[PDB]
Point group: C5
Chain length 147, copies 5
């Protein structure tokens, strides 16, 4: 049971498909607090328009303040074109790059699904498990291991 009362965590989330984003952020926040003793005042939450902006928003934020771990949250749903595949591939590499360039643990809270239902299910609705909870724990664990 890892506890991180002194950890400063950053959460950057996109605003596309808010129906699925909100639950994810909550589950992450609630879990860090209620289960890892992270302090609410130590959790910064920022948003960007879409998943494409996630890597950029995180990079700008960890250059200004100091965080022990970051959680990038976004929901990409396959559409009619190849837009979904290209954005997904670029964003995932971008998030990995920002983490490796900065030395700050970047947790993957990106969902890349085929339809809305799949997203809601992974956000804890319709009998599914909220994946945000897992991301909060990973944030805490990686943040501690980085000291």
């Amino acid at each position: 049971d890892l506890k991180g009362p002194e950890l400063r965590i950053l959460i950057v989330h996109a605003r596309w498909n808010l129906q699925a984003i909100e639950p994810l952020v909550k589950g992450a926040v609630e879990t860090m607090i209620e289960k890892h003793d992270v302090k609410l005042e130590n959790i910064d939450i920022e948003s960007v328009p879409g998943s494409w902006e996630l890597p950029q928003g995180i990079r700008a934020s960890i250059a200004r303040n100091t965080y022990d771990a970051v959680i990038g949250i976004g929901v990409l749903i396959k559409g009619s074109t190849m837009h979904f595949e290209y954005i997904s591939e670029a964003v995932v590499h971008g998030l990995m790059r920002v983490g490796l360039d900065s030395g700050v643990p970047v947790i993957l809270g990106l969902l890349t699904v085929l339809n809305e239902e799949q997203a809601l299910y992974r956000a804890g609705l319709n009998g599914g498990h909220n994946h945000g909870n897992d991301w909060g724990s990973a944030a805490v664990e990686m943040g501690l291991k980085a000291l």
Copy 2:
């Protein structure tokens, strides 16, 4: 989407392939920044390059000469008969992401990667579709402000 950026300097680089779709996209972006976010016309630079492949390179060259708070890269790639479309799309997207992360300047994705021309026009606001350029205009202002201030 309420944000105002009267002091923001925005750069728009667009390719010239599939101009039928490019033009509306650029207008929607410009119009939205101006009428909805108070950006000043004189603070918006517009440049062009032959194709989407040049977008990353054109943007890189420009943000090295002047100072911008945000950049919008606009291009239209349509699937053809070869694998050309797939390889260019992949490299361009990775290039635009790199330019943004290397420079610290927000780069907005105004790239359409479609199966046929009808899909592009529809996303440019023609034939009953929503003009995606508008969303790009708003995103540029938002990311520009979250960096300058």
Copy 3:
């Protein structure tokens, strides 16, 4: 198939980072890697560090942090990704594999790939030495030793 060496690395310091998803398959892999280095290459138990991270996504990051603090001759990254219902599997697998390659090239430290990217659980267990399969961890142990010695 592979062609391991008989090389001995009694002075080698080896690091093993593994994720914790699908532990059923992870455990046998790690054991095989450790046992093989020790019993077959003369690596010393005390010279093998073992760390863990939540998921495969964390592997490149955990390895990067660890080789920045201590000095290792070789690193083995171990994780198990199983195709699910979304495209999550494809995108994480691609990013992690490129990430592990980058950490190895940036640092100069050999990073051994102990990542399984499978369609279902049965395939993972089979590659972990269960149900009549060959334990791939063993091969990784020999590779770690071989690369660690060629870096000296």
Copy 4:
């Protein structure tokens, strides 16, 4: 309507599928000269075994001399294995990297086709349009805009 009498242009082309390569190179050269007033003596032409060497040949050459723009030309045809897919992906990312790293515009004269007929058609044979011309014009434009 762009003219570049002082531009120095480099062309690196592979030698696999020369039947398609030659016309592509000619089209690019002819167009730069005849339509953009580029001078014959200001156009260097080099070759490398295959498309895989394109990025490397270009990087080496722009480190020795000064060019305003580079055109990389090569032809990849899908074969029986996955070789085509992996080389294509690596070469394209390689050419983009060299352009961004060096600051010198790199024009994409790479064809990634399914069979030989497709390549010849794009080289102007059998009633097709010679793509090399477009690459010549793009080189001139990007070379001028780099100043």
Copy 5:
């Protein structure tokens, strides 16, 4: 290029050891072609091996940092299996080999085979009526090594 001779060239060859049946002929073809057709000296050709294709980029990087080579040939054979392992390793190795060559300035020749089954690999190694691809790689190493001088 007429007939290139490189009697003073120093060439490095790193090959993996998976699927040796196909590897050996590939290496021979490359060595023989360099010596017999390009006048490269046997004593100027270093040959190293690594467990698998995943180690090629790393093995090559370590070696060119210790000695000086005019060109490098990376040889490995990947065969599609029952999982997605082949696809991910192939993509990462190919990008890794391109990176090492561009980072170092030393030409890295691609002697990697990414096939669907063993038969395809043997064929490309010169068995069963096929053309030994290692020969072409040898000539490419010599040509690129000379053009770097």
